[PDB]
Design an enzyme around this catalytic site. Sequence first.
Site, PDB file in Angstrom:
ATOM      1  N   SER A 348       0.815  -1.202   0.000  1.00 33.29           N
ATOM      2  CA  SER A 348       0.000   0.000   0.000  1.00 33.29           C
ATOM      3  C   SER A 348       0.858   1.264   0.000  1.00 33.29           C
ATOM      4  CB  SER A 348      -0.937  -0.023   1.221  1.00 33.29           C
ATOM      5  OG  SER A 348      -2.063   0.804   0.998  1.00 33.29           O
ATOM      6  N   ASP A 468      -7.918  -6.614  -5.907  1.00 28.33           N
ATOM      7  CA  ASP A 468      -7.698  -5.449  -5.053  1.00 28.33           C
ATOM      8  C   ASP A 468      -8.307  -4.229  -5.738  1.00 28.33           C
ATOM      9  OD1 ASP A 468      -6.861  -3.283  -3.575  1.00 28.33           O
ATOM     10  OD2 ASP A 468      -4.787  -3.957  -3.368  1.00 28.33           O
ATOM     11  N   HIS A 498      -6.416  -6.423  -0.888  1.00 25.60           N
ATOM     12  CA  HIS A 498      -5.331  -5.628  -0.309  1.00 25.60           C
ATOM     13  C   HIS A 498      -4.607  -6.355   0.834  1.00 25.60           C
ATOM     14  CE1 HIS A 498      -3.540  -1.701  -0.654  1.00 25.60           C
ATOM     15  NE2 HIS A 498      -3.654  -1.452   0.641  1.00 25.60           N
TER      16      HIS A 498
END
EC number: 3.4.14.11
Lengths: 763, 763
Positions: A348, A468, A498
């Site tokens: 991320s 995702d 994610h």
Amino acid sequence: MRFNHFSIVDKNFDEQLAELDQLGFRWSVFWDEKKILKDFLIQSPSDMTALQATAELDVIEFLKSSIELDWEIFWNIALQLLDFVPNFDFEIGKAFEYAKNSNLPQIEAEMTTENIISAFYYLLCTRRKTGMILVEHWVSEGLLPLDNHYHFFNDKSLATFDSSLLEREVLWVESPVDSEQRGENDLIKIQIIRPKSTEKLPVVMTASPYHLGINDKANDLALHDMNVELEEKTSHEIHVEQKLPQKLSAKAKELPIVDKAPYRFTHGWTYSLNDYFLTRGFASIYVAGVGTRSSDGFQTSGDYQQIYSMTAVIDWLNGRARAYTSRKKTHEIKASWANGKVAMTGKSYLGTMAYGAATTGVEGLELILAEAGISSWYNYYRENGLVRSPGGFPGEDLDVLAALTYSRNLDGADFLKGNAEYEKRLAEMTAALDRKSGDYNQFWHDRNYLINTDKVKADVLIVHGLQDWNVTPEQAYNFWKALPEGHAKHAFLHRGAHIYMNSWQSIDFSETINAYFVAKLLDRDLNLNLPPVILQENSKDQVWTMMNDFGANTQIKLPLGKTAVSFAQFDNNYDDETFKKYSKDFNVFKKDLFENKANEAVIDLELPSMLTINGPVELELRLKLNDTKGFLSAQILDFGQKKRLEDKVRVKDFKVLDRGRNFMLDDLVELPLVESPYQLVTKGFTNLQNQSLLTVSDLKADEWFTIKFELQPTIYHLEKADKLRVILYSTDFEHTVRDNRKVTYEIDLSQSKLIIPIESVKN
Amino acid sequence: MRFNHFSIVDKNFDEQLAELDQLGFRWSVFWDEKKILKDFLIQSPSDMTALQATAELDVIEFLKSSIELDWEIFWNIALQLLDFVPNFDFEIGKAFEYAKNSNLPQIEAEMTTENIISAFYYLLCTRRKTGMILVEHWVSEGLLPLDNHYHFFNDKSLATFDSSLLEREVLWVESPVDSEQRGENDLIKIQIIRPKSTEKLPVVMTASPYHLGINDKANDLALHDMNVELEEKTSHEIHVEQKLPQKLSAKAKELPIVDKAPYRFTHGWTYSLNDYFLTRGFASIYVAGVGTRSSDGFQTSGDYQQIYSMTAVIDWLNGRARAYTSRKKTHEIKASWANGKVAMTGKSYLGTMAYGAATTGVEGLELILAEAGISSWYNYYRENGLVRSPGGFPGEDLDVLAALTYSRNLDGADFLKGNAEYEKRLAEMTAALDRKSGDYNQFWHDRNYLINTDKVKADVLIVHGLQDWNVTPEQAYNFWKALPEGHAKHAFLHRGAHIYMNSWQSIDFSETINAYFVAKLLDRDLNLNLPPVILQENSKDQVWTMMNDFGANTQIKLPLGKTAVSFAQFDNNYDDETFKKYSKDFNVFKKDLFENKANEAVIDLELPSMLTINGPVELELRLKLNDTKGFLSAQILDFGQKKRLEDKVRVKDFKVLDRGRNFMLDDLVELPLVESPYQLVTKGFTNLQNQSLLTVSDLKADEWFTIKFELQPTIYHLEKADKLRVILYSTDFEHTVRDNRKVTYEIDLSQSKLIIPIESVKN
């Protein structure tokens, strides 16, 4: 169950014998095979007395008997060492076949002393049912001592560094940025975790703005209201130019140099992959960057000032930047324990910093392992001139994230001194976002790393989940495509959302990265030969394969029209009761949307032949609407009852993964294959006034026009019998603004086509 | 948020000063309060420069200013030390009030040096927002060194033992049982984890048959089919007598004695509570017992032979039993490092072993911490002459569990030598279960510890979830009631299901147990004064209270009849389509059952006044049915939309609980308060032919009769406006046999009453 190995490095016999010798298995080519087996078991930490050799004898009895060793007996024993339960997980006497069906590495040749030695060598490289390769499992059980020296096996570093001797230090690196223009360099706090070693240590750095804490309250308060009206745009062209932040140089100073850091810490967040490397001779460094707790500056979120606040750490590790023992700047500290080689990890926001840092070309940064990262912030909060909230998070934008990660405010003393300046700069950011138009602009351009990929020198390893929708696949796809030709790059694409993938049972990810990290950070040859892309197959249980590229050149075209006279329309406006229940819970809307119970145009396409989508799907549509403004939404799902992988992991075993010697025990997990009525393949959005991101045009009402836009890139395989549900609509109560005006869309399906890039495969 | 403390021991001022002095806080009664505050912060591991003192000043500025300390400033600072974020979690200047609303321990008296010293003393005993009391948090950060010596604060042992020096040894204790009648004593393997110490160490033992592995395949294959017919019983009386297993004594042997155990291990399952105690000077011992991996015997599951296989460990620790270095019995080992004091921990099967072991009166076993344990196996798999599967597990019985925990078969070598004898004995067990009648018998009587509670000498601490339908509350309730008068006993009843509660934010469980364990295992005074029962209140967020007993004497009676002419009936038989969808998924049945959409009799009772149920509810019913066999089922739910605690925990923070110094990091969790349409309060079942467990009688068809049976005991508080949904029915597709014969039940509601034991409270 099924295993997949990408970490096994091929080695010659002489190499194999030498490595085995180092582990304590001192064998010779003229030894008897049963003697080799006996020595292998006796020299290991396993319990020989509990092992079964045949349907009638245990190992001890087998060794005492005159029966000779064959491949079935070998596998009966090998599977037990790999943590499989004989008589229950597998059938004694059919072990060879069971190993084959599980896709375990197997030697297929005559039973000889040499071939037996290789089978044991590779057995040590093989994953056990519980998540760890045999050799590492045995090392964690005492096969080798904790001598704090490097020990390599099959090009992997073993866990021979004592985690009880880890040093945890804190210090401030002098960055070349002045995010708040105070006329001084921003000091950036860093946390160091390093094992004891008599030689310079590589570094595994994780740049995480979350690391020192998060401000949830400020996050929720900055959240934007999606229930607003869609503004019309005026015909114009957007102009941008790239301008990198000027690096500020700090003056000279004659300060005394200390040997060890006086400030230390004990608790902190860590990435399990980084922990895995700590005991394998790799120090860890966590940085939060500008605008974070105990550091100076504003949370510039994404621009190169933040990137430089992170890369300064790499400069310091290479003796090109100054670090102090404290914020008082009275004593300087040097990276005397580091070799200067660095690798960045994390997912991320952390993976985002890795992409960014890579585009600076900073020397020392040998490679990045960017997971679910952002290559251009615009695409994370926007899509084709439209405000598009990250999947699962409506109302979020860069200013909401800034409030979440401006952790300086978590300290009361800091709040007192810098809150005023913070709100002032956050307001300025909010205005720069321009949620009114949703168009690309200079502010976004300064947070687009794709324009600097020509400066990337580090090897690039990308990890991304194909389900995702938070951090969309285009992020990985775009960086992948912008990388210069012939550049060392590899991608791991899984079916999760994610999430991390270094604790899965189906792939030897950590072991593969191990080999890659040692070669790049310890200046050794990289004998590991990885394919361009390692892909986890959809609708399959624990099956991984390899592809030559992400994004194919070949493409087939499917018409949306079933006849020559096919028109379809739907409204934008819902009843006020339905509109408010969709706005309160976008999940009920998605349910209806997918089941064709909302305002939408659905096209069920029967697939001709089986095919593998590889890249972004294009939608060529001919439509018209009674308005001068509007946007279009599109989702494509694999429709029909069928077993599919969920995007959320399920636990296989608890605490079976040891990142050392009873160090950071972790759970073995895996994406489950379950029956579902359908699954989202890809989606996309576009503002009808945006022919491209840089050009906005007027829209004519009641007039036919054609638009061409791509959806999120992906790789999905379909069988000739599967069906693709194409959904066209406007308002998405999860991503876009919620305008309930009375507009009507009309689409000419016979003039509308679905362009799909497919893997030629040359089947 | 709300906190609840039960671990704070009251101490005099002189005692407080002495304990503070030991921590490095050397103060005197004539010091200035700001000086004391300054010293407190400087001597601690906290960062003074980040702390805010007032709306205008940080701590440093406050100390330099002339402003005097008051309780508001004190709390502004204290809340920050407790991990609360100023300006976001709470309002600076209103800290005192915030602390009060959070139920934090507070000193309410004039600001003086003495009162300030006490406020700091108790602040150290106070829980932080992140799950650990301040003193332990600071100890984990370096407040005290790791000297492997005992350090006590407020009667609690601190984490001063180095986890890196833990010894992990394996050895076999000679038990006095011969579960398979081989003419030899069964050797029982045990795993020892002990810190380094210059003095004898207490022991925290966990008897877990699961510990060395489980056999899931064998479990699923032994599973019983619930889709069978209900057999009729003949009038007769069941006769039982208690007969304890004869302890077998092993002959004399002149073997040499070794100092340290030669066999060791590195990986193993552990209970986080046991880990917490390892660094606090308490060794851990895990035993799996007879019939488990690496040990001799059969998996006698529950009887006293298994109990003795566990208690033998306690005998060995007290020099009353022999232990060997290996199964070859060539060398003997003694418990020279142990003081002989023991405490047993663990939940479910482990808590069951604690209850059982306690009923033997074995010397050395000072106390048990039995969580979700079984006091009588009959009630775990049966209920009032009926086969009643544990909640969530239809088809399970003692033989299915035996197959799951007979881990000797997990070793191929062992399977070869003892599988035949195992199946032979499992078949014998299966027949002894008598699933045909479901009645109590001698086999069950040998697994009933309640008849031996008169031999209990150890303090008894009970933990049980009031929403645990796996291991029903009656298990804890019965043991509680059978304990002799005046016996030291305490119970913690939470609202969760079959889960642990030592990592919750709302209660200082671990710290409370800490104090209790040191006093009992280290021969010190127990100054901790705990109430009979610590109860977590339903329909409340993080609220705990105390009660005088479990099971009240007072009771009110509510009629089920709304009129003088009220009859109700329902069928036993469903349509074949509905019967098979209920058998395939008992959850759909429960849904319909609760929503009155199945064959049942529902009585919605409006509650007169608010009341607190405390004990087992009784159902006096007058019914009749057209058959000579049958059973009755009853469930009572708190009906109506309202916020209620779920039975499953939710994560508050990840890895914030340190069981040492970066040792076994754990997550802080808590049961969430969410809105639900209803919630199960209690349920019960009974065979209409069982007036009591020991007497079976004939049943007359088409004839009225009255039955009186109790439901599961519990403690639940209701408001005058709440409604109790009473559901009467037969077949339960989750617990009982599934017979679909055509029978009709008729109940005379005006002659039917609900007897409810209520907490008088003397409101």
